[PDB]
Design an enzyme around this catalytic site. Structure first.
Site, short mmCIF file in Angstrom:
data_model
loop_
_atom_site.label_atom_id
_atom_site.label_comp_id
_atom_site.label_asym_id
_atom_site.label_seq_id
_atom_site.Cartn_x
_atom_site.Cartn_y
_atom_site.Cartn_z
N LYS B 17 35.04 23.16 40.46
CA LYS B 17 35.72 22.81 41.71
C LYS B 17 34.95 23.27 42.94
O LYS B 17 35.07 22.59 43.97
CB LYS B 17 37.19 23.21 41.76
N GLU B 26 38.42 27.93 49.43
CA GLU B 26 39.05 29.05 48.75
C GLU B 26 39.02 30.27 49.65
O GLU B 26 37.97 30.63 50.17
CB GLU B 26 38.21 29.29 47.48
N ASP B 101 41.29 23.40 48.62
CA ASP B 101 40.86 24.09 47.40
C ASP B 101 42.13 24.83 46.92
O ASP B 101 42.58 25.86 47.39
CB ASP B 101 39.70 25.00 47.70
N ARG B 159 29.43 30.93 36.93
CA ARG B 159 30.27 30.96 38.10
C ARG B 159 31.16 32.19 38.24
O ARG B 159 32.22 31.98 38.87
CB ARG B 159 31.30 29.78 37.99
N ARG B 161 33.30 35.10 39.81
CA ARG B 161 33.66 35.49 41.18
C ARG B 161 33.53 37.01 41.29
O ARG B 161 33.51 37.71 40.29
CB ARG B 161 35.13 35.11 41.42
N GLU B 164 35.34 39.50 38.88
CA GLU B 164 35.85 38.84 37.68
C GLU B 164 35.18 39.39 36.41
O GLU B 164 34.03 39.81 36.46
CB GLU B 164 35.55 37.34 37.80
C1 LIG Z 1 39.44 33.57 41.70
C2 LIG Z 1 39.65 32.24 41.27
O1 LIG Z 1 40.16 31.41 42.44
C3 LIG Z 1 40.75 32.34 40.14
N1 LIG Z 1 42.09 32.38 40.77
C4 LIG Z 1 42.52 31.46 41.77
N2 LIG Z 1 43.78 31.75 42.15
C5 LIG Z 1 44.17 32.87 41.40
C6 LIG Z 1 45.41 33.58 41.41
N3 LIG Z 1 46.36 33.10 42.29
N4 LIG Z 1 45.55 34.64 40.59
C7 LIG Z 1 44.49 34.97 39.77
N5 LIG Z 1 43.30 34.36 39.70
C8 LIG Z 1 43.14 33.28 40.54
#
Ligand SMILES: C[C@H](O)Cn1cnc2c(N)ncnc21
Ligand SMILES: C[C@H](O)Cn1cnc2c(N)ncnc21
Lengths: 313, 300
Positions: B17, B26, B101, B159, B161, B164
């Protein structure tokens, strides 16, 4: 064209709200007034375990210095989102049945509620922010989730001298006077905020005036005497000095949700029967709404009885 | 009174995405710094600690629940400010196309439902988030992704984040939640009544079986009374879920291809999306303003 009267009894705990409303309900015909009570059953059991018990001890252990702010904030934040669920869900199932506003003939049905969603998505969270157990960002996340304000949202807040309130409160939650002061302050702020918006207050125009209660009467309060004043927190301010847009948009939402509310102040500094008769006189100036379908009356009535039946005390 | 096209690009993360069209990105800066410090890292560390037995289930759930509030704030505030500008359906090219997003349901339902499946969120907390899902406005076009699991693992691995942890159990859970979501919308659109089919879960138009929808997740024992009945307050929350989900328009984007292809597949899907009218003459420009300011302040 049948009408409905919705009255949300709210304000700080310990004033006599539950009692006054049971007393008001006890005067009406079993079938023309229904009470949506405190969801004690959802609370101590169904949504989680002893929800109120986890809160009061965490703040008490935060006072001491046994758990940091972040630690208390995560517990307070998750406790609140779970605590507000019954109000939110009730508001969402009723929403489709509420038509436009509408003195007028007796309402076909009167729904009296123990609290409105803003107690759990605004007031309690702000009170915890003042107690140090919740971050301002988290309070604004709650604010952004307040549901659209339905037509005819009559909210009754309470008035009561702190001395009498402290004494009423001492009955047996733990004895938290700091929190008592904080919640009374927030509800005072809430009534002024409604007044401010109804007199044309634009927080964006008056933001600059910040430095350092009636809800339906009087002159326009100074922004410093409204809920907007709580959001001057450095956490929400950019390096430029003003609020990040994200937090500013949440204040826009706060402003929209409360601008259309109809707030009344009930004096609880009276006997229980006294409170009842005064609440009953107050309902005379409250706004009724039409319902969207003809069968909404019975439908809504059933929804309310069910909630009472499953989630009271 | 001009037309608007809203497109919410959602679905499980890690698939790919990442003037008359604006893209609301985002809100990574809200997650890492404005709303809290490093919210993704706190989420992934917490699940890791639970998985290793370092913290309790109840302990991880308070942490998860609070972090999900932070993750969701930008979508919810965005929906609340935009809502008033959205009119009825219109159906010609639109005056403005706003590509987002993610949609609020990512944070008020899917991620929460996935953490419930990972044992780090209670079903009651999940339904508290569902009760707060904003009313579904006309023209709510939601793009969900399709990609085989091993290609998804590959893509997700390249990918990650900030903060993560590569967790295959969470991948399967979020993938399952999103597949149930697509099934749920179709179930509701074809007439499915969860209340009528509830008995099919607990003891056995044409649509998916309720066991293949999100309703199956709510047969969680914490939500049931001693006689097996779902408490009414929770049944209520499911009524809201059906209402919110039924009127969304879901589009599936095949991500098992290149960015060029995805771009074009995405543009191809646009022909069946539903457009609305805005409610004011100044709505387009205001919406436009919102979109760009969000991106500048909160976009990575
Ligand atoms: C980081 C990425 O966008 C995954 N991601 C996107 N929205 C999330 C949420 N609301 N809770 C946990 N991980 C999420
Ligand atoms: C007895 C309680 O103090 C009343 N009460 C009602 N709603 C609440 C909330 N959302 N947070 C804290 N206390 C609340």
């Amino acid at each position: 064209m049948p009408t409905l009267l919705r009255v949300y009894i709210d304000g700080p705990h310990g004033m006599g709200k539950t009692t006054t409303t049971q007393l008001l309900v006890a005067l009406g015909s079993r079938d023309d007034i229904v009470y949506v009570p405190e969801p004690m059953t959802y609370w101590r059991v169904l949504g989680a375990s002893e929800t109120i018990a986890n809160i009061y001890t965490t703040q008490h252990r935060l006072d001491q210095g046994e758990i940091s702010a972040g630690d208390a904030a995560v517990v307070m934040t998750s406790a609140q989102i779970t605590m507000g669920m019954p109000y939110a869900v009730t508001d969402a199932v009723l929403a489709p049945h509420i038509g436009g506003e509408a003195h007028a003939p007796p309402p076909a049905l009167t729904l009296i509620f123990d609290r409105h969603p803003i107690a759990a998505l605004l007031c309690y969270p702000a009170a915890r922010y003042l107690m140090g157990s919740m971050t301002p960002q988290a309070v604004l996340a709650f604010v952004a989730l307040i549901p659209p304000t339905l037509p005819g949202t009559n909210i009754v807040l309470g008035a009561l001298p702190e001395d009498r309130h402290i004494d009423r409160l001492a009955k047996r939650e733990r004895l938290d006077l700091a929190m008592l002061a904080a919640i009374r302050r927030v509800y005072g702020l809430l009534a002024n905020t409604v007044r401010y918006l109804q007199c044309g207050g634009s927080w964006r125009e008056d933001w600059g005036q910040l430095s350092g209660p009636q809800s339906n009467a009087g002159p326009r309060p100074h922004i410093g005497d409204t809920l907007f004043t709580l959001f001057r927190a450095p956490e929400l301010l950019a390096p430029n000095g003003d609020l990040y847009n994200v937090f500013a948009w949440a204040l826009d939402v706060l402003a929209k949700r409360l601008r259309s509310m109809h707030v009344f102040i009930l004096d609880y500094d009276q006997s229980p029967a006294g409170c009842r008769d005064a609440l009953l006189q107050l309902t005379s100036g409250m706004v009724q709404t039409h319902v969207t379908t003809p069968g909404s009356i019975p439908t809504i009535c059933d929804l309310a009885r069910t909630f009472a039946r499953e989630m009271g005390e």
